[PDB]
Ligand binder design. Sequence first.
Ligand SMILES: OC[C@@H](O)[C@@H](O)CO
Lengths: 63, 13, 223, 214, 54
Amino acid sequence: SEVTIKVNLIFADGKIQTAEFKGTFEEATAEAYRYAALLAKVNGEYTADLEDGGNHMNIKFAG
Amino acid sequence: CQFDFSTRRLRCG
Amino acid sequence: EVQLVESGGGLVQPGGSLRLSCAASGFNIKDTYIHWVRQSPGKGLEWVARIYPTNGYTRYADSVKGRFTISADTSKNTAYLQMNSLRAEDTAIYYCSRWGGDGFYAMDYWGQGTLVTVSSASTKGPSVFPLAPSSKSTSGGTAALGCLVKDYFPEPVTVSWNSGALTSGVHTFPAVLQSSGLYSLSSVVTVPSSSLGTQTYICNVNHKPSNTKVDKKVEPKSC
Amino acid sequence: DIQMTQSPILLSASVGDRVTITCRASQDVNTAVAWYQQRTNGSPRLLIYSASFLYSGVPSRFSGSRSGTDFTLTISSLQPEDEADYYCQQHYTTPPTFGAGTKVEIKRTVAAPSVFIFPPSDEQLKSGTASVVCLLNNFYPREAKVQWKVDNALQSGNSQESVTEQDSKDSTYSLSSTLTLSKADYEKHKVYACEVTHQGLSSPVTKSFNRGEC
Amino acid sequence: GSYNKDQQSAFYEILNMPNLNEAQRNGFIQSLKDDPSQSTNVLGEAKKLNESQA
Ligand SMILES: OC[C@@H](O)[C@@H](O)CO
């Protein structure tokens, strides 16, 4: 079925953005990690913490 | 998210 | 100024036919490609067809091939989309655009779009009711009032206030489909409380598909 | 055909922030990708063409990039007027195809709604139906709970909500809730109440009227 | 505008279809005029519609 993964994007300077990915849990997951990796190129190494069975993520960038 | 004629915008959730 | 203006969109029964036009100005369609692109809840932005008026070459989306034809009259600087054997899935805003204009390889001008509604339901004009300002619609020295535009079909309607002179503080809500299969929306505006009774407030409602034009004066109700 | 996959589907960020949205082609499309913006009530408007080139008149805070079959659109300093949907499109092969879009919203401070209520008009009551309207004006965030009560009985299944897109001047929302009853039902009850729950309110707010009161 | 024998044949087939109404019949004829390159496709879709309205 279709789910929404909600993501907090937490940047090194304390700024916070939020995003959503939709699809099967597997598709949305992959997309969220893909997006994190992309932002990491500019915003520094990321770490992703999963809550709510993986359906919510807190993604912090090192700067 | 789903496009709506009335607003010409995607509506999410 | 480059401009494209679509016309001809309207209610049509399933299996029916409609013809759209795309009037270009400010450039010559002989110099570009012309496209039809549609947009719908079901499929989002979907390319329909294109033509190169200089040599007449055309291409079509698989889902419309045989049912739709694109053409162009360069002497009128106008392109067309004939739409036959129409289905619910064809319900969409239809835009025309140009591509290759001034050497830009993208769709750089799009028209305002024309809505095509494929449905067996019949046209119905709206009832327009006031949302009168009252002791229950005011706070902080400002007051809300509005118009309820209820029970119409098909889209679109337009709503303005004081013939477009009043725009600040206006909220016109997205149309909702009622269980009846008819649309409804409200438009409200917030104004100074002190202006009630001295400033006239009128909502201008137009429902072209039913030829319904209403200008409804909204006032505090007499007690 | 070529598929264009856009991520994320929704992104919310503060004014002045740098935001990045992405678009992936299912196969090579060279640089033949354009980005369009669609604002409320508007048509698609060209921002970027051939992956990285700014269309005339587009603010320089927009930029685009390509890496293989991955495309990015960046806004370097998000502005209130950038609140819109963004679409990518490949023109490498026929049919040209579009991504499903990314909605970009503006983050701002919490604001509680102004809550108002409108009885049915006497005009409408001449016919057989009554519409009661509850109005929530200029609030943020979008989440809000509106419940109807008629003579203190919670109503279910007989109201519809509608919410505007973010305001261009203050990035807030407004919402209408419309309760629909027969005239006969309306004339049978006395107290009409809409209760609003919203993060900006310290506790729920009830706006009501008695039918017949001026 | 003039037509070759294939084009004329397509017009004739659509003109004669018994289960089209006149709005549909003329819509398809208009399509044949609009885009000759689509004659075969247009004829096929006219046939399908005619058959479904039998
Ligand atoms: O004016 C187009 C649209 O906003 C209205 O028809 C209500 O949906």
